[PDB]
Design a protein around this ligand. Structure first.
Ligand SMILES: CC1(C)CC(=O)c2sc(N3CCOCC3)nc2C1
Length: 846
């Protein structure tokens, strides 16, 4: 423990935002055991990754070139403008070529690597040039592929620092509820529940006594279950109801060492303000204001859970009907008993696993043991093609068993980096449903991070996001981050530092300029100086030379641009900031637009934004583009965070506020005028018109399904290139989504007719809607996880099921294609009704 090793920990604690050495809010050594446990996966992956490739973090995909991309290349040859000092020449390179093929056969026509100008993206590795993500991004936006001919980054910069019984106890389980002690204030009773994967097994209560600062009981709660029957994962959930639920706390009956919990406990509970926070094994660190629960566990010696070593056609059809059901459709006892009985038969269908392992009676050891027998042989699931939507299901709050969950993590392993990045956020979030800190999932994330800088970059911010504002899961998440920062490399270790410094500094300002204004949502004149002033105050010798853009790790942001910085006219007062690109190779003077806001939980914007990236790739599988704009959004604090800025993009409302004004006399021709006027060449007007139809279709569908299509006119934007997109995702009038008359005007149907564009629109919709329905289960699980992992409010069964109706489950496919168009019609039959109401509701406060 050198003085040097004692400062490093002081450092990490800063890059994490929580000190993983604060045994002040723990009743055991699980976290510590976990840090000690992650030391191997970390080092193992660290001392196993190719230093060269890792240094350049190539970004590729094995997926086939989409229809629109493939069917767009000039026959079988493309062009990549190569750069150097100042010189540059264009080369004809086939799609199936490789970085090795080029550069080498190129070197002999006039020992070095190809890097994208302005970015930290090198095109290296033995992979088809077409397989490179960045390149696909070029073709997509129809752009040239310029790259500087420079030397490979020194792989030595990623250096890493110097690194007694069993089932022989048939006595019923009991717990002594000594009392509850609350510092400062009808009746109140304690409710102990033996839980397992949100599945309540046994439950007891205490005599309703008077609610005072201290309410004793010293009453033993005898359950009906048995010690031998307690499953590895069983959780002791303690709750307090009034004379409704008020305080809840949990305690894992079986610990990380497979040992039965025992002794005295004075756990500090959480107070209610269903979701993943009620599942936490952590205690409230606020020992001064939090309710306390004193309990006692029977005194013994040391019991330990040992680590275990043809049908009627009418029934077949009945089983099948159960297996081919959506994730949200429950199971009757008949169902479960049916599923169980036919274990092995239900084992031949991967799609049956979630439903199958939910029919298990985990409150019975003999059964659980049998279950472990079923997992002993699963060639079907093991050989079946990976199904994320299926894999994800086994990772939610419905499966507290590590053996079951570990089979999903096993499937995840198959996923290439590209895919890991698509689901990273939800996976990270899925750690909340893990009954123990050290878990197969936690490790997978760690490995995949230390394995790839990209994944590693994002893993950091996702994890950090939670640690900052989540008292319920910060610890576990903090220990998982520490394990990552200790193997990613001094290089990244330094990038993260630079990144954190900037952020923290900018948050200071963001919240500073916020106080200097209340109900006056009008940016004062003397406040414009306050901002410009403080900004330069940092440029002096504070703001690092050039941090890296969190939502875009490839981008290096240099010095600011105080001149172009301001404070949006929002009743919250965000911070519009522009940055110069630190990379002098970027063939553009164009700045970097980043926003900093407070008041809205950007964690929700994140989830919703990532789902959008999902829907875009989901369509790519069906060869379909919708031009969505899932701009970058990274959370960092409670109601703080940063956001990317789309260039040349205006509010749809503002485009109306121009031609019209401070009224609701919305005119249809407005929008269509904006495009043609903004886009000079008659050609660009034509193209901008197409983008809109596609972008509008894309967002119309996605927003509907997510249940966030009916939003004010202010929450929707558009670009001088026709691309449209939504924003700020953080007894009356309603609507599926937004398809206002000004929109349809650009399609060719001012009134209620049709056109060669509106039919294009409708056709694209269903072609997109039916595509997402193909992945009904995936979207249901994600949406379901997003709600209980991201949406604070105690998500109800009713809220989650909205996704079912939206995707029209059960209903035939034919009725679907029609169901959507019907929704479109609902919009036409409302013109500016819903919108006009939002104006009267918001702009007039009614
Ligand atoms: C304050 C505000 C409404 C909150 C929010 O979520 C977004 S998202 C956004 N976009 C991002 C893309 O570039 C244009 C602006 N502005 C804002 C501003």
């Amino acid at each position: 423990m050198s003085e040097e090793s004692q400062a490093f920990q002081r450092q990490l604690t800063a890059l994490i935002g929580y000190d993983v050495t604060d045994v002040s809010n723990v009743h055991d050594d699980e976290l510590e055991f976990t840090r000690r446990g992650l030391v191997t996966p970390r080092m193992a992956e660290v001392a196993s990754r190719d230093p060269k490739l890792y240094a350049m973090h190539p970004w590729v995909t094995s997926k086939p070139l989409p229809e629109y991309l493939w069917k767009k290349i000039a026959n079988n040859c493309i062009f990549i403008v190569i750069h150097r000092s100042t010189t540059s020449q264009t080369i004809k390179v086939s799609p199936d070529d490789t970085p090795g093929a080029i550069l080498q056969s190129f070197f002999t026509k006039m020992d070095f690597v190809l890097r994208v100008c302005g970015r930290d993206e090198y095109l290296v590795g033995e992979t088809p040039i077409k397989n490179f993500q960045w390149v696909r991004h070029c073709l997509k936006n129809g752009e040239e592929i310029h790259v500087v001919l420079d030397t490979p980054p020194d792989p030595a910069l990623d250096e890493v620092r110097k690194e007694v019984s069993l089932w022989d106890c048939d006595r019923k389980f009991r717990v002594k509820i000594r009392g509850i002690d609350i510092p400062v204030l009808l009746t109140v009773f304690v409710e102990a529940n033996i839980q397992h994967g949100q599945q309540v097994l046994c439950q007891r209560r205490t005599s309703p006594k008077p609610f005072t600062e201290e309410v004793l009981w010293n009453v033993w709660l005898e359950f009906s279950i048995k010690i031998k029957d307690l499953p590895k994962g069983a959780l002791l959930n303690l709750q307090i109801y009034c004379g409704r639920l008020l305080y809840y706390v949990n305690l894992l009956l079986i610990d990380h060492r497979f040992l039965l919990r025992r002794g005295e406990y004075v756990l500090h509970m959480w107070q209610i303000s269903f979701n993943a926070d009620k599942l936490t094994s952590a205690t409230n660190p606020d020992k001064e204001n939090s309710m306390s629960i004193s309990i006692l566990l029977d005194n013994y010696c040391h019991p330990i859970a040992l680590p275990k070593h043809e049908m009627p056609n009418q029934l077949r059809k009945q089983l099948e009907a159960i297996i081919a059901t959506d994730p949200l459709n429950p199971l009757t006892a008949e169902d479960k008993e049916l599923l169980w009985h036919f274990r092995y038969e239900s084992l031949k269908h991967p799609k049956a696993y979630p439903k199958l392992f939910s029919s298990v009676k985990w409150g019975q050891q003999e059964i659980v043991a049998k279950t472990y027998q079923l997992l002993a042989r699963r060639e079907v699931w093991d050989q079946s093609a990976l199904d994320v939507g299926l894999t994800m299901q086994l990772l939610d709050c419905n499966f507290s068993d590590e053996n079951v969950r570990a089979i999903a993590v096993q499937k995840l392993e198959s996923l290439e980096d590209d895919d890991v990045l698509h689901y990273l956020l939800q996976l990270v979030q899925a750690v909340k449903f893990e009954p123990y800190h050290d878990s197969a999932l936690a490790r997978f994330l760690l490995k995949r991070g230390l394995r790839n800088k990209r994944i590693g970059h994002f893993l950091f911010w996702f994890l950090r996001s939670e640690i900052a504002q989540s008292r319920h899961y910060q610890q576990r998440f903090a220990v998982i981050l520490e394990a990552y920062l200790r193997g990613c490399g001094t290089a990244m270790l330094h990038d993260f530092t630079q990144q954190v410094q900037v952020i923290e500094m900018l948050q200071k300002v963001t919240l500073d300029i916020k106080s200097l204004s209340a109900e006056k949502y009008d940016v004062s004149s003397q406040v414009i100086s306050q901002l410009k002033q403080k900004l330069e105050n940092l440029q002096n010798s504070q703001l690092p030379e050039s941090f890296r853009v969190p939502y875009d790790p490839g981008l290096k942001a240099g010095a600011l641009a105080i001149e172009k910085c301001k404070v949006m006219a929002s009743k919250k007062k965000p911070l519009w900031l522009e940055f110069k690109c630190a990379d002098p190779t970027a063939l553009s003077n164009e700045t970097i637009g980043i926003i900093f806001k407070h008041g809205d939980d950007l964690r929700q914007d994140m989830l919703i934004l990532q789902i959008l990236r999902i829907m875009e790739s989901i369509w790519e599988t069906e060869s379909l583009d919708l031009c969505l704009l899932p701009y970058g959004c990274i959370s960092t604090g409670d109601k703080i965070g940063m956001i990317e800025i789309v260039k040349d993009a205006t509010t749809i409302a503002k485009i109306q506020q121009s031609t019209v004004g401070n009224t609701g006399a919305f005119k249809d021709e407005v929008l269509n005028h904006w495009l043609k006027e903004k886009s000079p060449t008659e050609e660009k007007f034509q193209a901008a018109v197409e983008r809109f139809v596609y972008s509008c279709a894309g967002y119309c569908v996605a927003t509907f399904v997510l249940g966030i299509g009916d939003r004010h006119n202010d929450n929707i934007m558009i670009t001088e290139t026709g691309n449209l997109f939504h924003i700020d995702f953080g007894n009356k009038e309603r609507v599926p989504f937004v398809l206002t008359p000004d929109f349809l005007f650009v399609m060719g149907t001012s009134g209620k007719k049709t056109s060669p564009h509106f039919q294009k629109f409708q056709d694209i919709c269903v072609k997109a809607y039916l595509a997402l329905r193909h992945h009904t289960n995936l979207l249901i699980i994600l949406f379901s996880m997003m709600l209980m992992t991201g949406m604070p409010q105690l998500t109800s069964k009713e809220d989650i099921e909205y996704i079912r109706d939206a995707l029209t489950v059960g209903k035939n496919e034919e009725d679907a294609k029609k169901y959507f168009l019907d929704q479109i019609e609902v919009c036409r039959d409302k013109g500016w009704t819903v919108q006009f109401n939002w104006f009267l509701h918001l702009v007039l406060g009614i």
